[PDB]
């Protein structure tokens, strides 16, 4: 259920993104981009288990 929780967390992070045309990006998209390593680490740890 913790793996489930991180899956819904990642889905909400993905749904929270916004896209601007020519390389512009929102002030909150940086935070969403920094939150990725936690998700990839949890997925790798689960795969290792």
């Amino acid at each position: 259920y913790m793996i489930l929780a991180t899956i819904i967390a990642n889905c909400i992070v993905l749904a929270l993104e916004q896209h601007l045309p020519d390389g512009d990006k929102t002030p909150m998209s940086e935070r969403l981009d920094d939150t990725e390593p936690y998700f990839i680490g949890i997925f790798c740890f689960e795969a290792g288990i």
């Binding site: 601007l20 045309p21 020519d22 390389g23 512009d24 990006k25």
Partner: protein, 100 residues
């Protein structure tokens, strides 16, 4: 006046917004007389002059045309930074070496 038109040519203004911004800057320049001094700056994570002018120049027909051409030749790209742009604006309005 002593204008300084900060145009926000960042990524998020591509398409219709940039068209309206360049038309609006042209129509804003068309309300400046020969007693008025104006420059046009543009910022996207870095603020720069849009034209060959480095300071506030008189708003006569020739200078207004140069600024209009520079604004018409402008493109949108990059992340916004409202601090490096207003710093440029407030610095160019603190120049007293030039005629004003």
């Amino acid at each position: 006046k002593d204008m300084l038109i900060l145009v926000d040519v960042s990524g998020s203004v591509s398409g219709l917004t940039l068209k309206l911004i360049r038309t609006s800057v042209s129509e804003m320049l068309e309300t400046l007389s020969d007693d008025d001094f104006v420059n046009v700056a543009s910022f996207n994570s870095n603020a720069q002059d849009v034209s060959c002018f480095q300071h506030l120049v008189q708003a006569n027909v020739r200078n207004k045309k140069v600024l209009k051409d520079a604004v018409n030749n402008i493109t949108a790209k990059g992340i916004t930074d409202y601090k490096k742009g207003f710093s440029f604006a407030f610095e160019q309005l603190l120049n007293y070496n030039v005629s004003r």
